[PDB]
Tab-separated table of C-alpha atoms in Angstrom:
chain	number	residue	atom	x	y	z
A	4	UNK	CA	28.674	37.285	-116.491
A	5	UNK	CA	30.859	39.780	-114.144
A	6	UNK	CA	29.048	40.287	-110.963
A	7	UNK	CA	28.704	44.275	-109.387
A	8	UNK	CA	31.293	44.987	-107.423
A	9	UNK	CA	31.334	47.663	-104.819
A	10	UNK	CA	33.882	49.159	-102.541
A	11	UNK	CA	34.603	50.091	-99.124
A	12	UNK	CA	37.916	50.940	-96.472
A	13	UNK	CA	38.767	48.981	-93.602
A	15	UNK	CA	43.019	49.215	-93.828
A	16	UNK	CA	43.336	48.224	-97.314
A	17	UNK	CA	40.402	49.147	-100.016
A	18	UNK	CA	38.386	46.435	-100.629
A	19	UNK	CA	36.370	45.719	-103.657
A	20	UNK	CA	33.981	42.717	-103.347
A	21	UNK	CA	30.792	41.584	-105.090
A	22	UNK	CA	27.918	42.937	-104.355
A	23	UNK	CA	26.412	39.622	-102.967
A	24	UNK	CA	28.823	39.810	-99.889
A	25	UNK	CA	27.791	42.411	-97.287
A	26	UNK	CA	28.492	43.937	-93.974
A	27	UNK	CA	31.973	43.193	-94.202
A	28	UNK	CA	33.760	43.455	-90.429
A	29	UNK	CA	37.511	43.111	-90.197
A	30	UNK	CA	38.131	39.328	-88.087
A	31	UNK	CA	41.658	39.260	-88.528
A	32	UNK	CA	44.740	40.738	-90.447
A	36	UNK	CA	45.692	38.106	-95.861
A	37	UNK	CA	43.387	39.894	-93.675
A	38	UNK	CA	40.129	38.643	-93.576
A	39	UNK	CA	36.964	39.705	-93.012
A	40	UNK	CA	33.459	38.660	-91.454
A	41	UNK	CA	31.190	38.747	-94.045
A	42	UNK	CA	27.306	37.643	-95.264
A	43	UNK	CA	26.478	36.257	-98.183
A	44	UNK	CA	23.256	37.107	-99.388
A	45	UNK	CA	22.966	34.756	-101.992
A	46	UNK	CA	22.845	31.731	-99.652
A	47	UNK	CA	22.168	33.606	-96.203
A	48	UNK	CA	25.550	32.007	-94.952
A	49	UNK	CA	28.113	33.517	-92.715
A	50	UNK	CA	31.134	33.857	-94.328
A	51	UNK	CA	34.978	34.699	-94.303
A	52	UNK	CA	36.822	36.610	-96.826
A	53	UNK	CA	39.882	36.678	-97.215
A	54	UNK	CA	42.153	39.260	-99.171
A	55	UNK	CA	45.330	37.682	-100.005
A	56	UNK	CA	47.576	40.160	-98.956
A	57	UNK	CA	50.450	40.657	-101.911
A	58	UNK	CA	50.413	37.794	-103.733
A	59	UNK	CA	52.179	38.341	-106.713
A	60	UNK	CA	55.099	39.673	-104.712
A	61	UNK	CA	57.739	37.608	-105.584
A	62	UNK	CA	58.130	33.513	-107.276
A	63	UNK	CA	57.647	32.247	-103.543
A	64	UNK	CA	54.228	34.523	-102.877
A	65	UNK	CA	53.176	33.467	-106.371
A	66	UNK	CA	53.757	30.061	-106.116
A	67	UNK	CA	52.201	30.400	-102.388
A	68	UNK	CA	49.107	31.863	-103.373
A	69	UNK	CA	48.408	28.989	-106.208
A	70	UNK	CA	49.585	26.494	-103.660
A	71	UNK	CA	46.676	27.675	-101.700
A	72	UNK	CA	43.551	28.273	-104.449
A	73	UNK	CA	44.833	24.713	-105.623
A	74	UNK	CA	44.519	23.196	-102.399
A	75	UNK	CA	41.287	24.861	-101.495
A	76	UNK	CA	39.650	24.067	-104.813
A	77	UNK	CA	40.471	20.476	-104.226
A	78	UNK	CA	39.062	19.931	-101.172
A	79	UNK	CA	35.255	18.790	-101.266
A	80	UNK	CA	34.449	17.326	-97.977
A	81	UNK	CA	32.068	17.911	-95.044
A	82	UNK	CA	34.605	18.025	-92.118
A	83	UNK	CA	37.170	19.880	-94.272
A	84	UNK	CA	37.196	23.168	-94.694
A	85	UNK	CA	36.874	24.294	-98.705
A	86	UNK	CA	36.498	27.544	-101.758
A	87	UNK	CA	33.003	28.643	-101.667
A	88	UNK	CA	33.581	31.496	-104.263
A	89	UNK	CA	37.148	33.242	-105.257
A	90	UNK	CA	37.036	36.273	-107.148
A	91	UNK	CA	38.809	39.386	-108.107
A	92	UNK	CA	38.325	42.685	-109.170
A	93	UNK	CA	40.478	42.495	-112.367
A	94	UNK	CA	38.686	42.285	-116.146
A	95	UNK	CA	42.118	40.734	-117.701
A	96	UNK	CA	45.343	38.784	-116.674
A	97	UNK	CA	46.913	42.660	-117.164
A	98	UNK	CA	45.002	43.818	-114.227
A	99	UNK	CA	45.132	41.074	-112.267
A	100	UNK	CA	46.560	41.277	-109.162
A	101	UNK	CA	44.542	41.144	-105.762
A	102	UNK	CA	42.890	37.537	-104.985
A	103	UNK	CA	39.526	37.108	-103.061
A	104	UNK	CA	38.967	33.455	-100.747
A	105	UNK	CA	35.671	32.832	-98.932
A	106	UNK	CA	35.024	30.156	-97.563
A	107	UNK	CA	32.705	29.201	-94.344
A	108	UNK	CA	32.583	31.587	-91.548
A	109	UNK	CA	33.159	29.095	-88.564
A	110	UNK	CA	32.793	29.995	-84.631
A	111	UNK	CA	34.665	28.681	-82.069
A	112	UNK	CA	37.706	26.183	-82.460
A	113	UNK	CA	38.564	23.462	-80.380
A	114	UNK	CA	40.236	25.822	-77.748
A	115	UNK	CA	37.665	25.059	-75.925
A	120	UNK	CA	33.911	21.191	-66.664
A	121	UNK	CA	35.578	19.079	-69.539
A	122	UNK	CA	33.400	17.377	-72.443
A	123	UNK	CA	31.592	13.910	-72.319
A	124	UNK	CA	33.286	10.966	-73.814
A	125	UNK	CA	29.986	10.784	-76.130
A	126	UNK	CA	31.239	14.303	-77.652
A	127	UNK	CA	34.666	13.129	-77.673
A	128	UNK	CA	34.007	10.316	-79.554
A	129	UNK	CA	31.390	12.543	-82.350
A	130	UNK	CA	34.383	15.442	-82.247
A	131	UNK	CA	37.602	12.833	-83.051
A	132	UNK	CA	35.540	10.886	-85.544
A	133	UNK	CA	34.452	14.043	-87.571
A	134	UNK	CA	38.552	14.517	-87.737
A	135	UNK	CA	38.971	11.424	-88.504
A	136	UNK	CA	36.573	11.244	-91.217
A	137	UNK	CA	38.091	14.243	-92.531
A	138	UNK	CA	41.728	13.016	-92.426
A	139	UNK	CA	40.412	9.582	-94.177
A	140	UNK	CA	40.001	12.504	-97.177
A	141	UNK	CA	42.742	14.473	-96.731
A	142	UNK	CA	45.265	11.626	-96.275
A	143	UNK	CA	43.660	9.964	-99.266
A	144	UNK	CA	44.684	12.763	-102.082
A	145	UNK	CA	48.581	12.126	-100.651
A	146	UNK	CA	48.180	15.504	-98.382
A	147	UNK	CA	49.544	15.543	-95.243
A	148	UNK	CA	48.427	18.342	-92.989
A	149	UNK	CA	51.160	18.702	-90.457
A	150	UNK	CA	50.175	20.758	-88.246
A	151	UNK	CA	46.939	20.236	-86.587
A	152	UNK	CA	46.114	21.815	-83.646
A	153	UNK	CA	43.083	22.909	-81.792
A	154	UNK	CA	43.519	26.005	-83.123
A	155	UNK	CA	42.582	24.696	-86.560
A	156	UNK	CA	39.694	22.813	-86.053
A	157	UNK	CA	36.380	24.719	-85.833
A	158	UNK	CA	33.164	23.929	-85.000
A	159	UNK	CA	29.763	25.195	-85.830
A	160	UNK	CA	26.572	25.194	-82.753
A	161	UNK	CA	26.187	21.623	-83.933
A	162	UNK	CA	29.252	21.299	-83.069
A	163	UNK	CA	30.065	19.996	-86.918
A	164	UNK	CA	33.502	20.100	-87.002
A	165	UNK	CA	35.840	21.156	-89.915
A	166	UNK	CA	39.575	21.177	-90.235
A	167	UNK	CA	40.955	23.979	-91.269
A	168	UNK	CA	43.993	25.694	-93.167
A	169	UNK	CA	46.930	23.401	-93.370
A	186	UNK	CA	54.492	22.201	-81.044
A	187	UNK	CA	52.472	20.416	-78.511
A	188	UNK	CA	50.603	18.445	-81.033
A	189	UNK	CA	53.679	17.658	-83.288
A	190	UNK	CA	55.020	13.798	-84.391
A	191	UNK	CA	58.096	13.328	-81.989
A	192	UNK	CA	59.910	12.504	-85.560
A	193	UNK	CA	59.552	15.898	-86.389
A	194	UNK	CA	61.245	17.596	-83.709
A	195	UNK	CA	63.912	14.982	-83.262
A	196	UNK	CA	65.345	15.200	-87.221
A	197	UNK	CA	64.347	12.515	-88.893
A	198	UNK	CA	62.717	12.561	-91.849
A	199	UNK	CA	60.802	8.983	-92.334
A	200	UNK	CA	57.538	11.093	-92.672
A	201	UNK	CA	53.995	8.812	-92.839
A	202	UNK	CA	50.827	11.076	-93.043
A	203	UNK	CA	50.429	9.502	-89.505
A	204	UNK	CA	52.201	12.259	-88.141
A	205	UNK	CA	48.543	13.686	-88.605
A	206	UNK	CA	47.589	10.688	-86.304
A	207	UNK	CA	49.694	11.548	-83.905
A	208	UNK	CA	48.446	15.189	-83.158
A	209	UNK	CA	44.897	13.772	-83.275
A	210	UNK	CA	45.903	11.178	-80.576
A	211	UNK	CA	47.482	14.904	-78.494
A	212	UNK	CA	44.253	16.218	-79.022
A	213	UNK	CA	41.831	13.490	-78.314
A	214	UNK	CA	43.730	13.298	-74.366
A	215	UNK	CA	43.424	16.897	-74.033
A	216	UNK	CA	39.449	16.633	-74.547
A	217	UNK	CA	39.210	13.489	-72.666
A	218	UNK	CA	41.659	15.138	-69.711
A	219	UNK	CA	41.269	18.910	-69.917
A	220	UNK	CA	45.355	19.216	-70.082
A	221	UNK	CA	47.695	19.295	-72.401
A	222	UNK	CA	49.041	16.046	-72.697
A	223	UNK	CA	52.634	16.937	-73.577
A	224	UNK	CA	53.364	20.890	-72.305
A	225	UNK	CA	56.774	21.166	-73.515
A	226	UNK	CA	58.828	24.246	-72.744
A	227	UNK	CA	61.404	23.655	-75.613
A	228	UNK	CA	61.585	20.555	-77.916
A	229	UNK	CA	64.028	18.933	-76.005
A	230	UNK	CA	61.490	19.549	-72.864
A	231	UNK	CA	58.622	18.018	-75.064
A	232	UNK	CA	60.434	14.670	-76.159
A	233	UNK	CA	61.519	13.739	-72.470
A	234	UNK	CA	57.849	13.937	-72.132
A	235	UNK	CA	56.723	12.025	-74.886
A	236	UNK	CA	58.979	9.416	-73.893
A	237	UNK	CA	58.314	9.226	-69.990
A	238	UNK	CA	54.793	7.720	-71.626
A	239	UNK	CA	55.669	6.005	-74.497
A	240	UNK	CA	58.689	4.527	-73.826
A	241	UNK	CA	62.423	5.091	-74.650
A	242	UNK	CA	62.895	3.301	-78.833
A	243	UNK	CA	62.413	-0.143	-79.341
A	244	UNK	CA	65.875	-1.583	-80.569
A	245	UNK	CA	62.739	-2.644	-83.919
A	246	UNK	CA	62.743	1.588	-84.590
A	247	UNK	CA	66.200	1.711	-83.776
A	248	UNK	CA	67.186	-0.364	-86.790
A	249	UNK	CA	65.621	2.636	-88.557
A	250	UNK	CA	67.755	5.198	-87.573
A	251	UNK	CA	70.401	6.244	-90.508
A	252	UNK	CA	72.907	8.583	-88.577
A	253	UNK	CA	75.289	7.359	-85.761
A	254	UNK	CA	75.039	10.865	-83.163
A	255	UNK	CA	71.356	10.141	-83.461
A	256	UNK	CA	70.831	6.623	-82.578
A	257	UNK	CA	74.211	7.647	-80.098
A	258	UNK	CA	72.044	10.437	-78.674
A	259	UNK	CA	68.549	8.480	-78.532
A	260	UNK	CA	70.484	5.470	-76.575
A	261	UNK	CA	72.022	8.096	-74.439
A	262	UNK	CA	68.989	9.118	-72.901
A	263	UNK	CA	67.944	7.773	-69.604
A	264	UNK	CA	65.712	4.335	-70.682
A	265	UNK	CA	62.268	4.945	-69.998
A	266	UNK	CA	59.942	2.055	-69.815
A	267	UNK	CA	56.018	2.578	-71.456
A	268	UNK	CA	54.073	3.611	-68.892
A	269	UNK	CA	50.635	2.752	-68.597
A	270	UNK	CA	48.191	5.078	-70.246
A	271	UNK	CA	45.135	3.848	-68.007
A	272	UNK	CA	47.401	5.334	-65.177
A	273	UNK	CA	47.006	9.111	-67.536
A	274	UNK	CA	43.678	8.436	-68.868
A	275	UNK	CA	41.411	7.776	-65.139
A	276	UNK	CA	38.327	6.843	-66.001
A	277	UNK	CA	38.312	7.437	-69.513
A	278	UNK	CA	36.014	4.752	-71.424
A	279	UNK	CA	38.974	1.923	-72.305
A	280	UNK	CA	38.263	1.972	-76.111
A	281	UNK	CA	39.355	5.361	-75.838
A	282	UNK	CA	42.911	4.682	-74.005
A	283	UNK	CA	42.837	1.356	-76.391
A	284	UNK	CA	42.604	4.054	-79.256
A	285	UNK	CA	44.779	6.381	-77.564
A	286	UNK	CA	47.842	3.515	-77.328
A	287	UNK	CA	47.228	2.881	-80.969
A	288	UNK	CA	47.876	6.557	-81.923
A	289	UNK	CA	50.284	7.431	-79.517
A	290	UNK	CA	53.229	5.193	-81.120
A	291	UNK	CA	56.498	6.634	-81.533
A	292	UNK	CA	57.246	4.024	-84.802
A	293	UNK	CA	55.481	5.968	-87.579
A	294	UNK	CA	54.591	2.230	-89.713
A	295	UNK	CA	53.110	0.603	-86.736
A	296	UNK	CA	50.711	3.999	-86.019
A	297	UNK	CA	47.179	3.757	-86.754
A	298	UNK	CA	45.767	5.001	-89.674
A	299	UNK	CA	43.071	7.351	-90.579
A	300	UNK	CA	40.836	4.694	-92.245
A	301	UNK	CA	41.813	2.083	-89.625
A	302	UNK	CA	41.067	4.564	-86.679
A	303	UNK	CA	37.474	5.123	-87.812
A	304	UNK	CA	36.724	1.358	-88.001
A	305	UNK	CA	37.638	1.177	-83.882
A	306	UNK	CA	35.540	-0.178	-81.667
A	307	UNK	CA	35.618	3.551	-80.015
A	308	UNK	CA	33.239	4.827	-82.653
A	309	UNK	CA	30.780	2.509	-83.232
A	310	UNK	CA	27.986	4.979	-83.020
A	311	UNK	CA	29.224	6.988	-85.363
A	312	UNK	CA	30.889	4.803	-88.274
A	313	UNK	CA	29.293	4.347	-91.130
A	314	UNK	CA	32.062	2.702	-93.909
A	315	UNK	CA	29.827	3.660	-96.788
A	316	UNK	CA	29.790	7.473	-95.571
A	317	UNK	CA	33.789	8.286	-94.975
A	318	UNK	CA	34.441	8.706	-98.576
A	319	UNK	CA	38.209	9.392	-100.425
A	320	UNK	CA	39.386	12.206	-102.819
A	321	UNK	CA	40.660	12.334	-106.443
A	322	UNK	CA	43.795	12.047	-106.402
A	323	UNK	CA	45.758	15.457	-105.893
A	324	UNK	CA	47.981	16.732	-108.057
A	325	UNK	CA	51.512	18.326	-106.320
A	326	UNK	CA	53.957	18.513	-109.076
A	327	UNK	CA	53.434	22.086	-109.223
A	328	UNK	CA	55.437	21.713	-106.022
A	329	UNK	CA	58.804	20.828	-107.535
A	330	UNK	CA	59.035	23.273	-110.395
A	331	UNK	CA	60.611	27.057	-111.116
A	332	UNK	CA	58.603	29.264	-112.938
A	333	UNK	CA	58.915	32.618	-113.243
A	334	UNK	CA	56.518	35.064	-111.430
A	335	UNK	CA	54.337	36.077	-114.828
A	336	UNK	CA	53.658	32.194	-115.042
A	337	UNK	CA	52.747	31.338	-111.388
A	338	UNK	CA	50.416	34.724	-111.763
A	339	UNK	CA	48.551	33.168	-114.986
A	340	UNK	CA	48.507	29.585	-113.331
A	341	UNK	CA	46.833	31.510	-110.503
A	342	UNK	CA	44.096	33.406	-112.935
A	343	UNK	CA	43.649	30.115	-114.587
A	344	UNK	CA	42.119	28.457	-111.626
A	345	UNK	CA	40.310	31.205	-110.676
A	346	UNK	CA	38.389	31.663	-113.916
A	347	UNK	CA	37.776	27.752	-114.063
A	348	UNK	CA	36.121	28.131	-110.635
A	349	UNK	CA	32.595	26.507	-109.989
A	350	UNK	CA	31.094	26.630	-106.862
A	351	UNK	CA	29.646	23.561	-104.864
C-alpha cells in the first residue's frame, strides 16, 4: 500500500513518509539528515529540486534514479527507498532519494600504510563494479568517497585528481581515467599532500609530467591532430622521475602500484580488476568476493524525448522500486 505521509518546513515544504523522522537540513536537491525508523539507520534524503523543469532536468533526474537503482554493491553508494508524494502520473512532480547517511569523506599525523592499503582496496573493489556495468565515474575525488567509524568506505555520486587526457583534449577515454584519480588519491594518503596542486590546467600538466615523463614517441603515434602532438613535443622533455624519490618510505608495493596507475598511456594503465590482484593487497583480496554488475543499460543516453515522456520514464522506475 501507500505509506502515511506527513509534512514539515525547512525552505521548501517537505512531505515524507512517516517512517523517516527528525529531518535536519545537511545541505541545499537539498538534502536532509534524516532517521529511518524502520531499520534504525541514519539516512540522507534528498529532494530533487525541480526536476521536471525542462527535457535536460527530466532526462537528468532519470539519469540519476536509473543509475542509483542499478547500483548494488557494498563500497558503492546505492537507492535505499525513493518515493513521492503524488497518487498518479498527473500529480507527479517532486522526487524523494535516500540513500545511506555517511560521515566523514576522505578529506581527511597521516594514516598507516595498513589503512591505506584497506581504504584503496575498498575503492578498488568498488570500481571492479562500477567499471564492470560500462560506467565510468570521472570524477573521483576525496570529496566523494565516504566512510563510516569502520571506516567502510563507499563511493559516492558520480581537477587535482583528473586523467591528464582530460585536461589536455583528447578524447581516447578508458574507464582508467578512474585509475588514475585513485592512483592521485592513494599518494595523497600515503604523503599527506596533494600530489599534483595545480593552479590552472596548464599548471597541473607541467606537473604531471615533471613525474611521469614527457610522451613516449609509443603514445605519440596516438595523437590525431598536428598543433597537439606540435604542442606536446614543444614542451621542455622531461625524463620519468623516480617515484621512490616522491614516495620516502612508503612500503614499495605501494610505489610499485603507484607507477602502475600513474601512466600517462590510458591502454597500458592498470585496471580495476588487475589492481586488486597486486601484491599491495594481499591481506585484503579475496577474488571470489570482488564481484561484477549486470550489465547497464545507457541508451537512454542518446535519445530526445519530450519532457511528458522523460517524466513517465521517471514514475516508471519509481513505482517498480524494491528495496534491498
Amino acid at each position: 500500500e501507500r505509506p502515511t505521509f506527513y509534512r514539515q518546513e525547512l525552505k521548501t515544504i517537505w512531505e515524507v513518509p512517516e517512517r523517516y523522522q527528525n529531518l535536519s537540513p545537511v545541505g541545499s536537491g537539498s538534502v536532509c539528515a534524516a532517521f529511518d525508523t524502520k531499520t534504525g539507520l541514519r539516512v540522507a534524503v534528498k529532494k530533487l529540486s525541480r526536476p521536471f523543469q525542462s527535457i535536460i532536468h527530466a532526462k537528468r533526474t532519470y539519469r540519476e534514479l536509473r543509475l542509483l537503482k542499478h547500483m548494488k554493491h557494498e563500497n558503492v553508494i546505492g537507492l535505499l527507498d525513493v518515493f513521492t508524494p503524488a497518487r498518479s502520473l498527473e500529480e507527479f512532480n517532486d522526487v524523494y532519494l535516500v540513500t545511506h547517511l555517511m560521515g566523514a569523506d576522505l578529506n581527511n599525523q597521516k594514516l598507516t600504510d595498513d589503512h591505506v592499503q584497506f581504504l584503496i582496496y575498498q575503492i578498488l573493489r568498488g570500481l571492479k563494479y562500477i567499471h564492470s556495468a560500462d560506467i565510468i565515474h570521472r570524477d573521483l575525488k576525496p570529496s566523494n568517497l565516504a566512510v563510516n567509524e569502520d571506516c567502510e568506505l563507499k563511493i559516492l555520486d558520480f581537477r587535482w585528481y583528473r586523467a591528464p587526457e582530460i585536461m589536455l583534449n583528447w578524447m581516447h577515454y578508458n574507464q582508467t581515467v578512474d585509475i588514475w584519480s585513485v592512483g592521485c588519491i592513494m599518494a595523497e594518503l600515503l604523503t599527506g599532500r596533494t600530489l599534483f596542486p595545480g593552479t590552472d590546467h596548464i599548471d597541473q600538466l607541467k606537473l604531471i609530467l615533471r613525474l611521469v615523463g614527457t610522451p613516449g614517441a609509443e603514445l605519440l603515434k596516438k595523437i590525431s591532430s598536428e598543433s597537439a602532438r606540435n604542442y606536446i613535443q614543444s614542451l621542455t622533455q622531461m625524463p620519468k622521475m623516480n617515484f621512490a624519490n616522491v614516495f620516502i618510505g612508503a612500503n614499495p608495493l605501494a610505489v610499485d602500484l603507484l607507477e602502475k596507475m600513474l601512466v600517462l598511456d590510458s591502454d597500458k594503465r592498470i585496471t580495476a580488476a588487475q589492481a586488486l590482484a597486486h601484491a599491495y593487497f594481499a591481506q585484503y583480496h579475496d577474488p571470489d568476493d570482488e564481484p561484477v554488475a549486470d550489465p547497464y543499460d545507457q541508451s537512454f543516453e542518446s535519445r530526445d524525448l519530450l519532457i511528458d515522456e522523460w517524466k513517465s520514464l521517471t514514475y516508471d522506475e519509481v513505482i517498480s522500486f524494491v528495496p534491498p
